[model samples]
Target: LELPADTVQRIAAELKCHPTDERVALHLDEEDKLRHFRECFYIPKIQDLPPVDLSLVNKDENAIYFLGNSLGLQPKMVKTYLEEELDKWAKIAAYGHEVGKRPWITGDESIVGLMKDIVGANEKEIALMNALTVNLHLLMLSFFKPTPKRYKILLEAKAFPSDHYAIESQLQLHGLNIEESMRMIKPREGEETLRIEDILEVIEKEGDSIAVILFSGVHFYTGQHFNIPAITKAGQAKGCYVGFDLAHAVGNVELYLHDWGVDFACWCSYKYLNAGAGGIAGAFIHEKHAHTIKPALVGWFGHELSTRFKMDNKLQLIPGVCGFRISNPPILLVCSLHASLEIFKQATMKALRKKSVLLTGYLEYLIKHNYGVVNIITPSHVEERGCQLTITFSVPNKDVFQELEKRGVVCDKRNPNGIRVAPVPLYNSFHDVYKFTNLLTSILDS
Candidate 1:
């Protein structure tokens, strides 16, 4: 398979200048179609951050926030939406459940329509509910029905700790031994990301014994975007259930869960979705499973709205994904997510992804040009990764991370010598990538 040239390299050729030229970033930002969308979110100023070293850089400038892979920067409208709900609560009290633009009782339901488009699912197939791990457990309880013949769960090695624990406990809950039931796939020796061929080979060889195939849509540490469609198809053909933990993938990359026929998936909104920390999470179940699958654990909220208040012990479960919700959603969280989803609706994932490719590619180009000793662990191909680029420094990673923090660069450090930087297309400008590389270069040089 042939890989295309880096986006920044091609653009530099057209401009007749080197990729390291500052004018390239300036020109890219000036012509950026998604540049205006950055104004919708609040970028933390260097002076306001706790780690700022005022002596090093101008305090008034916005920090180079490349941590969207962790917690996305807050949208400007979050406060407005939250205040609207708070005012409704003060005025209406108990009646807030059924009154106003977003009723407290049905607030979660109102936002799934917007989320459906983001995850590429029908409205009925999507549900806004508990945190990512909680939703994963809930979906696993329903989807992971282990037969004696097919009693194993296949997942990646070094999955986000929460996922590994969730899958392990799910096996224990089913009275299965963790060693025999959990099959963790790892990258080949000396490789940072899993090859698509290697993944498919495992599925073909061991799929008959696998009950559930759970993998993250994007590997959080390496930023590798797994091939969801191929995995789903291969798993299903072998009579196994397939699902994804989309915590890192949901808003960072394009997804078509419905078209791909994925059995189920879960994700948190705090990352690329741009909701505040601990924001509402979401889940998806295909429409095909509406009748075949039922929520193992039932709740009043999962009952149909029309007959929900009857409170009779009899459960008339709402069909599909919504039936998985166990309790009323926190309206404040819903409002925060709603605020961000509105911006996503306006910007659209297609356009955001278009900008993300160039934004991330430019970072890669600049790093390669200036820092010959640095190694990028994330996939070099745009199709195999999201906006995040996990880079390793030759010096002590913690020291480099601390120095970057002191200079007001907001990114995350991973163990064993890696730093994850994400130039979020919705809010980060091309200049952000440009500034971050310059700061990193200075730190490495010193």
Candidate 2:
């Protein structure tokens, strides 16, 4: 939607830097401070060996990571943060919680503040918690209270599998038939994606039966970004609780969970957030639901941090999302999250969103232009998509991905033939897009 307004200009700026992907190569050959960012992390070469240590490790060289949808590329600074915490553990031992300089006890504190920025949330609305699905379960435990009449849980048919399991198990635990208790909203016939109108109609029709209207903020497969505020409003209007699985959404798109009236949302930090492999998780519960729902999965850290010791051995839930913490959390993980989140703070969704639309549009324009059979599976509208542009390659050259991979064009392959390519704004440049398309073009010609 904002392509003519902004997405074009940013790509135009970046295209000047790299004429092709060869120059898009990370050679430390740039002037911008962000260009200096390339050296900050380690990206393994195609040969399946670490650049400096080709010592024939057991690790497969087959890893070309465009898998932020599953797990993000590890940040370069992760080791530093882990080492800092390890040093704290060595020096302070157990008291690293409050007594030491950056205690582990309250280490989750840093993430609470930082997540507010990543999530477009206020500090009080965010919670540093278990993994994405775990946090989703936690939120479900607290929020998915069903009465005898309005007990159905409304979900998108294409939601991540983890959510499907969670909902089914939840329904089973309550001795209810999943078919009876769980409602799946589907898209129209012949449509690969569901329309907002269909979703609106579902909520309106089953509004009374639904207890929670839960969907992924951005779906893992299609990379479609839902209208959070509009969906939230509709759910709330229909007298149902609204929640989101930010698993693919967080770090992938801008969210206003609190202001948008999202009852609860969860995401893992390992993906676009760049918190390394064993990253932490984040959840947001709007202030409206904060006080009403106590931490169903209680922990000492859930106690008011200030009175954690003096507050006695009580289950006093801390106010807001921080109140949902079960443990002090991994200090090292928080450190990594803090580092990556800092980058996001610098290049926020608002700022990067402009570049994102432009970059993806550039990729789509070039790829679809070059390969007529390559159809863009994701919505072309700026508001409907994120940094990702999904392409379904033609059957004739389905193996074209492998050819491009041989030429050093890293992209993700999806099931049945979808190729999910994205130009992350914080790290990706216009040159990357140009190079990506050029390689595709070359491979197609071959």
What lDDT does each candidate get? 0.90, 0.72
Taking all chains together, the TM-score of candidate 1 against the true structure is: 0.97
Off by over 4 Å in 1: 1-16, 396-398
User: With candidate 2 superimposed using the best TM-score fit, by how many Å does residue 185's alpha carbon deviate from the native?
Assistant: 1.9
Which tens-of-lDDT digit does each residue in 338-360 have in candidate 2?
A: 77776776666676666566557
Relative to the unseen true structure, what is the Cα RMSD of model 2? 4.4
Model 2 alpha-carbon miss at residue 166, Å: 0.9
Question: Candidate 1's residue-wise lDDT over 46-134, tens digit each?
Answer: 98888878898796899899998899999999999999999998888999999888888999877778987799999899999989999
| TM-score, every prediction | 0.97, 0.88
How far does residue 104 in candidate 1 sit from its true spot (Å)? 2.0
